[PDB]
Design an enzyme around this catalytic site. Structure first.
Site, short mmCIF file in Angstrom:
data_model
loop_
_atom_site.label_atom_id
_atom_site.label_comp_id
_atom_site.label_asym_id
_atom_site.label_seq_id
_atom_site.Cartn_x
_atom_site.Cartn_y
_atom_site.Cartn_z
N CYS A 168 0.73 -1.18 -0.06
CA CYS A 168 0.08 0.15 0.04
C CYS A 168 0.75 1.06 -0.11
O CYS A 168 0.51 2.33 -0.61
CB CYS A 168 -0.91 0.09 1.09
SG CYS A 168 -0.52 -0.45 2.90
N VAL A 197 0.01 4.35 -2.58
CA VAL A 197 -0.28 5.69 -1.94
C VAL A 197 0.57 6.74 -2.74
O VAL A 197 -0.19 7.84 -2.93
CB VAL A 197 -0.31 5.86 -0.42
CG1 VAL A 197 -0.37 7.17 -0.09
CG2 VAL A 197 -1.60 4.90 -0.05
S1 CLF Z 1 4.97 -2.67 6.28
FE1 CLF Z 1 -0.73 -4.02 5.46
S2 CLF Z 1 0.10 -6.03 4.82
FE2 CLF Z 1 0.95 -4.57 3.59
S3 CLF Z 1 -0.19 -3.88 1.76
FE3 CLF Z 1 -0.83 -2.54 3.25
S4 CLF Z 1 -2.63 -3.48 4.33
FE4 CLF Z 1 -1.49 -5.24 3.17
FE5 CLF Z 1 4.10 -3.35 8.22
S5 CLF Z 1 2.57 -1.48 8.46
FE6 CLF Z 1 1.37 -3.15 7.41
S6 CLF Z 1 2.53 -4.96 7.40
FE7 CLF Z 1 3.23 -4.03 5.55
S7 CLF Z 1 0.96 -2.45 4.89
FE8 CLF Z 1 3.03 -1.45 6.09
#
Ligand code: CLF
Ligand code: CLF
Ligand SMILES: [Ca+2]
Ligand SMILES: [Ca+2]
Lengths: 522, 477, 522, 477
Positions: free
Chosen positions: A152, A156
């Site tokens: 994501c 973005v």
């Molecule tokens: S580094 Fe989350 S798993 Fe991702 S594509 Fe976004 S919803 Fe799916 Fe860490 S905080 Fe989270 S786990 Fe990744 S997105 Fe970022």
């Protein structure tokens, strides 16, 4: 303390008196805990219709979802291609989670890389990550294809995958002709199944869009099969087996069965099996393309119809008796191959099992959840069995899908007390199984917490979980099962009727109380 | 294996990489020399991962939500952003607790704001404020809320701090904004630090002006034990049998009131230095509370730790310490007697996060085993400084190892057992190498303390000596 | 009383207050029942070591046997031949029971006739019953072969089957050329498995004894397979599948898989499939003959070795990893076919599953029962899994078998706490699971009553049943399973590990009590 | 079908047989004429089965052990002879009881002498005597023993009566020898008669000189209800709501003391005429106790029966009778309103043992169903006399039907539902004909009484109208 000849792990170690006293002293001294009578009062309130009404007014809070995010599905799709590394452009935390999630369901290695975008890329973009990442992955892991999706962060900030991959080739980081299909996979749109569709359509376009001039529909004498997001090994296997028994030429497009089931023979195989690049390049020459899970293959369908000019049939998932029959009849029509004696007999063996077990199934009430195609197939087969699918939950469902399920429920008297829910989660479902209690739930491992909660109200309120779906983390090797076809229907039927008989045995096991009905024969 | 042979293995493995990656990875691979006190002379750490190489590391959200905050049982932690992160992390980590889930405790639940396109485009602060009111209605016994930021939050310019301040005042509730977006830092590690600062800024000072807690000279806090499989409870019991009063556990089975009471203690006992040194330093500076590192893996280390802790208090605690040691002596000696002869001489490779890669070595040695290679996902050089004396001469050290490196090192070194995580397990079983999960304990444990040692020994034996490992080769080839 | 919208069957109808009060009044008024405290005292006594010692001193009384009588096995053997009617010379009650017993296990029709000997034949013999019975059966049911066995009345009075059949042909009741193989099957010798052996050997002799002159060992390039008494459809199917995957020519001698699994398609098929008369006539021309279940195929072995001059290999049943490996290696040797890649891969997938599930299996203690070959294969696989088979019971076992199993136990440290029992029944086993409690039982449906008894002592004493064996009457469609080969071992492993995890979930489901260990992932 | 078509059906079926079987079977197949009162003018019964024709019948041991004696819950019943018979009959019949199995009740257990060759050659009487002592030691709360003879016993010249007398006197216990060897008679029926004589000779007279039982004018026994799925309990409840005192149940849920108390009652209420008419006639002759037949299948018959029974008593019972009828009226009427429109006009064929083939017809008619064919395995002509009035004109009757005949009749008549046993079920399901087990109730029930009628109606509906029955033809052929 421990006795060396009978060592206790957490359960039942912490039931020893010394531990129990220690945990009471912690609570009373320092936790400032709500009194037990207040805990019990609030618990009771959470089981009521009043609470359910408040719960179903939520607009901003989700609790205990029954869906995941797009790039999980893109990774699964990519794993189904020969010597293909899934690559998720963006932040590395995501890939740790995708890998672990699948590792726990399949009990197998899951290979996937990140290009490790950090705060520096957040503001200047991830072009350099792409360049070095592609080069590093190719050199180190020696894939023959790298299939790119996004996290994501990358969505973005607007990183242009096409441009970035093109520049990586221009500057020499990866060869010009090395295959790097891609798809944008935003986690804030749709769910994991939408990521699968986006990935697949990106791979299909990469191998076919610019080469359509020499293609002729039907010239290879095969039918393409696109399975969608599929986490039962037996589902890939049953489709291949049925087509082969019919003498139908086919190409399964995205086939991870080998790589998700390598042998333990002394070597680790990062890659095994999969759909070949030659099969994807030749796919427009098929007779037609069949989508096994059409409710999450809509982008794929538009490409296949618009570019390959295949007249994709309107088929439901091949689950249960009627929809397996319809699948086989349509394959027969497209291929010119008759349905063989073996499959006709297998169908009649399913029907025999339905006649054998109908008395225990009749009228049984179920709550259920999962992905749209899986859920509608389960509903369809429950109606065929004379069961009532009372609470039908698809968190990732849509309005058009809901209208189609409501139409299936209308075609049967066993649909009369059923409601279909979209956008609702497992905290919603928990209320439904308290206020309109069914006999069982059919769902994934997250349902165990609902069974826990129901038991706490009392044994007579407990709703046992029957584990069918994804993920299943708290039982071993269920990923080897089948849900599609007559074989899947036999396995599902067996599991449902034996769940009912197991529960009846539990309820009749009480000596000189309920054991008058503890029958040897059922 | 000789030092020269290990050095040559490193160079051989590095040959696969493009130049930039080669030069970087060389800096993260070393041959141990126990004489070195400044580990930077031998290895670097806590740097960005190279793209495309299949790091095992996670993100700052894992470090904050998954590690530090998630275990706190009577608060509701919101995974703020899209649906994935909270789902993958739901109930993955075995940070055990006592409570009534969904009623007064919430640890294995996944609360999320499930961002959609409109929330990305227009912002999620209005949705966050509405979510908070929904939580208050449906979970009235919650004792506070955390907001665990996922990647999009800071990228789109949301102001979660303003929402937390406005809603927190409105509802008279502790609402903690945590800026643990996964793009930040290079690993789980910065999420620990972010999380520690959030505890400091929003929770820890709440009782600074309160004088009602009745203290004793023996009050301690367990800092940095996440109660994996009950580890913290098998630690706590020993401390209290020694005459101490454990006011708080950070954060396994932890409650918000315990955290708020921690500035009242006499001594902070730090198990996980990596994840909690930050707040321990803060407490020393602000409140004058000393802190000390300890180790409750295996009898040698547990006995040493108990004695060191007791020496901070009076003769009465020292006497109780010796009583605890005498009680447990026959127990752990029976474990050694049974299991050491089954394990003596066996060789282990470890790869874990920020503590256990050094901390568990003494317990393996208590069973006659040798740790031939070790490394960390996300440790800093201060962790390596503590590792060099614990490992033997000429053993292999690896920081942020790549999947390729770990496989190739294992193929050459041929350990009898590997201890790592879920992403590694199924690879090494295929190769015929016994594997134990050294994060989740493979659904077993506890491993801390005397009661945990029994379990640890049983588990290492069951796996290393299992009949399955003689069966990988078909008798026909 | 009943409410029309929620009708109650026996359970839970009889839990209504009015029924409970009625039953109390019946008991108090008329039943002269022992006081409850005396019932409790006696129950507790039956759980003790003192009672176990008295129980193990029985010489004359059998309680809850774990075996059946010869003609049952003769009937199952006969059903495996093409268009063959099993015919049991003797008393008709026996046939009603044989048919019903199989009906309940397979949930299928079971065809068998009697010749309805009554008190007249009791003194003067059943010759007339044979003449009319053969004639009647042939005309009405149109078999191509009638395979004759005996009930105990016929055996006690000494009816000479050979003479009676020969006189039926001499007097014109059935054609001279119509095949009527026979065997004496006395219920007071051996068990149901002995009846299978006797029937099979009778059929083999009928078709081959007088035609040996033209036979040459190895001239047809096939291997004969003799399955023995087998009540899992998947066991016939896996052996065929494995041999076919290896390219091994084979003849399965006694193959009831089709007639025990006909489709529900609008017609009843009294006969389906089966070993052909031509296959039996040609069988001495095979390379060799392999006995799947050698501990109940001893008479058959003597005939095959003495008459057909096949050098029958010394192979255990192909259950578990080592014995499946040994089976395939010996079939390779005899046939000259190498073990193919498919089967090597399948073996490695079983080993992968063993590595995946070893932690939960390790050290688990079992009580188990069944027929000799099945029991020893289960024992061997349990040892391969790192499990302890503590109580091993074979009611129909012999001293030579017992020595063989003791040698298997001595070859593994996992066998150190195990004892093998022969001649003992399920009332003996009941005592063992009280005085030396295992984690689970593996057995047939009669085990449900032991589970019930153990729960009555208390939940912490309950020994759950895992249903593997024959008969299974209280679950549906388990007869479709597999226990042989790598496929059967994968099914057994999955069942065992998931039984363990199901029980652990039950014990950890208590909110704020045991649910600290109610893990999502296991 | 019409009369002529049914007669031609019978003749067409009989063409398969050899002449001797053909002549015999013709006598056992008929077209009903309800104007006939003497059934022997139309059908014969209770004859030997023709060899080789696949009769459905069992033997005298099934009739004695399985049917009559087995249910008596506080006695131990020995299956005396080789191992088969007791095993196939263990817990096959759902004769329900209340007790503590293995302690004070023994119904679902299999006790046997497991004859081996030495017992055949030299006799079993020494074995039997030792077996009895082992029973007494391991099952001290048994209240008596029966010895159920299998085929070999009388063939080898054993003397079980001498053992029973000698051991019974030695132990002061009722030990009942039963000569129900399966070769005797022609079916289950003779086993009923043998069993009834054994109750008469060894148990029923035990209290003939005891006057302590305090009798009442309202005392009855239920004779011939084996409590299948709880059928006798759903009968007893009504009788007692009517003000009667049910002193005994023969033999479902029955105890030895209730049997012994039966000669003290005022009226014997006979459900199963076939199996228990013998002892009912005995009790009338010896004790002066009248008996009457009744029928508790469906509301019409149940109401008629309650009124007929209450007429044997006084005005107070007659008043209670009308109260019971008024209480249950809205309940059964609600069953009919729900289920009769789903079942009206559907046609059923039955094949059962000795009672139910006529007894259930009223219940089917209460749901608007038609019984178009019926028959019995082992009924006598007195049963057929009671059948011809209950069945419609031109319906088909079959005695000791062969497998072949039943299949061919069903293929021509094409009923909507068949009611028969386990050996028939799976055949007709394959043919696409809904099937209900009318012995075991398909693991449902009770079917007796008002509560039973609701379950019966639900069961016939669930099966007859099930979705599965439209799925047998593949859509491609
Ligand atoms: S580094 Fe989350 S798993 Fe991702 S594509 Fe976004 S919803 Fe799916 Fe860490 S905080 Fe989270 S786990 Fe990744 S997105 Fe970022
Ligand atoms: S009519 Fe018994 S099943 Fe038979 S061969 Fe003997 S052991 Fe076996 Fe009736 S009494 Fe019994 S059931 Fe038959 S034998 Fe006779
Ligand atoms: Ca695996
Ligand atoms: Ca069937």
């Amino acid at each position: 303390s421990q006795q060396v000849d009978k060592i206790k792990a957490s359960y039942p170690l912490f039931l020893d008196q010394d531990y129990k006293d220690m945990l009471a002293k912690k609570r009373d001294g320092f936790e400032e805990k709500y009194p037990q009578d207040k805990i019990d009062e609030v618990f009771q309130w959470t089981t009521t219709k009043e609470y359910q009404e408040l719960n179903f007014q939520r607009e901003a809070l989700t609790v205990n979802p029954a869906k995941a995010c797009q790039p999980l599905g893109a990774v699964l799709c990519a794993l189904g291609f020969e010597k293909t590394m899934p690559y998720v452009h963006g932040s590395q935390g995501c890939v740790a989670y995708f890998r672990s999630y699948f590792n726990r369901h399949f009990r197998e290695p899951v290979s996937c890389v990140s290009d490790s975008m950090t705060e520096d890329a957040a503001v200047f973009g991830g072009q350099q990550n792409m360049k070095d990442g592609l080069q590093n992955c190719k050199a180190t892991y020696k894939p023959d294809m790298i299939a790119v999706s996004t996290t994501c962060m990358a969505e973005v900030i607007g990183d242009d995958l096409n441009a970035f991959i093109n520049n990586s080739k221009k500057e020499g980081f990866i060869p010009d002709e090395f295959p790097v299909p891609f798809a944008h996979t935003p986690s804030f749109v749709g769910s994991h199944v939408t990521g699968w569709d986006n990935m697949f359509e990106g791979i299909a376009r990469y191998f076919t869009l610019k080469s359509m001039d020499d293609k002729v529909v039907g010239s290879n004498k095969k039918i393409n099969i696109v399975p969608g997001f599929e986490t039962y090994l037996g589902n890939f296997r049953v489709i291949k087996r049925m087509l082969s028994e019919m003498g139908v030429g086919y190409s399964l497009l995205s086939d991870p069965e080998e790589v998700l089931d390598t042998p333990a023979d002394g070597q680790f195989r990062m890659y095994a099996g999969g759909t070949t690049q030659e099969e994807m390049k030749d796919a427009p020459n098929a007779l037609n393309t069949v989508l096994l899970q059409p409710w999450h293959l809509e982008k794929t369908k538009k490409f296949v119809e618009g570019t390959w000019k295949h007249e994709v049939p309107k088929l439901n998932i091949p689950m249960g008796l009627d929809w397996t029959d319809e699948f086989l009849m349509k394959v027969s029509e497209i291929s010119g191959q008759p349905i063989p004696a073996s499959l006709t007999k297998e169908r009649g063996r399913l029907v025999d099992m339905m006649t054998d077990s109908h008395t225990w199934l009749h009228g049984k009430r179920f709550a259920l959840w999962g992905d749209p195609d899986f859920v509608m197939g389960l509903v369809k087969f429950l109606l065929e069995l004379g069961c009532e699918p009372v609470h039908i939950l698809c968190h990732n469902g849509n309005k058009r899908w809901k209208k189609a399920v409501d139409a299936i429920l209308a075609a049967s008297p066993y649909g009369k007390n059923a409601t279909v829910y979209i956008g609702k989660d497992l905290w919603h479902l928990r209320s439904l199984v308290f206020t309109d209690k069914p006999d069982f739930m059919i769902g994934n491992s997250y349902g165990k917490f609902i069974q826990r909660d129901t038991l706490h109200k009392g044994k007579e309120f407990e709703v046992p979980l029957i584990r069918i779906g994804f993920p299943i983390f708290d039982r071993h090797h269920l990923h080897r099962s089948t849900t599609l076809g007559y074989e899947g229907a036999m396995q599902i039927l067996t599991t449902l009727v034996n769940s009912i008989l197991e529960r009846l045995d539990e309820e009749t096991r009480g000596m000189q109380a309920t054991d008058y009905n503890h029958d040897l024969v059922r | 294996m000789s030092r020269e042979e290990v050095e040559s293995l490193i160079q051989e493995v590095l040959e696969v990489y493009p130049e930039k990656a080669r030069k970087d990875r060389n800096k993260h691979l070393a041959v141990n020399d126990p004489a070195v006190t400044q580990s930077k002379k031998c290895i670097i750490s806590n740097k960005k991962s190279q793209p495309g190489l299949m790091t095992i590391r996670g993100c700052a959200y894992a470090g904050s939500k998954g590690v530090v905050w998630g275990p706190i049982k009577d608060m509701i932690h919101i995974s703020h952003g899209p649906v994935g992160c909270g789902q993958y992390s739901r109930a993955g980590r075995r940070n055990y607790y006592i409570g009534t889930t969904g009623v007064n405790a919430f640890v294995t639940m996944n609360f999320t704001s499930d961002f959609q396109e409109k929330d990305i485009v227009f912002g999620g602060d209005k949705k966050l404020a509405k979510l908070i009111d929904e939580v208050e209605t449906l979970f009235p016994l919650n004792k506070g809320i955390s907001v665990q930021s996922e990647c999009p939050i800071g990228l789109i310019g949301d102001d979660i701090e303003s929402v937390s301040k406005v809603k927190g005042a409105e509802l008279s509730k502790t609402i903690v904004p945590v800026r643990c977006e996964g793009f930040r830092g290079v690993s789980q590690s910065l999420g620990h630090h972010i999380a520690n600062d959030a505890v400091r800024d929003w929770v820890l000072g709440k009782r600074d002006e309160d004088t009602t807690f009745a203290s004793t000279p023996y009050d301690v806090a367990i800092i940095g034990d996440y109660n994996i499989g009950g580890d913290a409870w098998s630690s706590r019991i020993l401390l209290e049998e020694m005459g101490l009063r454990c006011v708080a556990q950070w954060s396994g089975d932890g409650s918000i009131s315990e955290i708020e009471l921690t500035p009242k203690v006499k001594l902070n006992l730090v198990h996980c230095y990596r994840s909690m040194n930050y707040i321990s330093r803060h407490m020393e500076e602000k409140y004058g509370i000393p802190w000390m590192e300890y180790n409750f893996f295996g009898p040698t280390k547990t006995i040493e730790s108990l004695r060191a802790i007791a020496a901070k208090f009076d003769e009465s605690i020292q006497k109780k310490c010796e009583e605890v040691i005498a009680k447990y002596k026959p127990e752990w000696e029976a474990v050694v007697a049974k299991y050491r002869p089954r394990l003596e001489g066996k060789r282990v490779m470890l790869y874990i996060g920020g503590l256990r890669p050094r901390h568990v070595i003494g317990a393996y040695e208590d069973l006659g085993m040798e740790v031939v290679g070790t490394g960390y996902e996300f440790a800093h050089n201060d962790d390596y400084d503590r590792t060099m004396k614990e490992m033997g001469d000429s053993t292999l050290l690896y920081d942020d190892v790549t999947g390729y490196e770990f496989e190739e090192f294992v193929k050459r070194i041929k350990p009898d057992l590997i201890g790592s995580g879920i992403k590694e397990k199924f690879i090494f079983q295929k190769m015929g190498i016994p594997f134990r999960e050294m994060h989740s304990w493979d659904y077993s444990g506890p491993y801390h303390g005397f009661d945990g040692f029994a379990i640890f020994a049983r588990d290492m034996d069951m796996t290393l000596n299992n009949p399955c490992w003689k069966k990988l080769q078909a008798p026909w080839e």
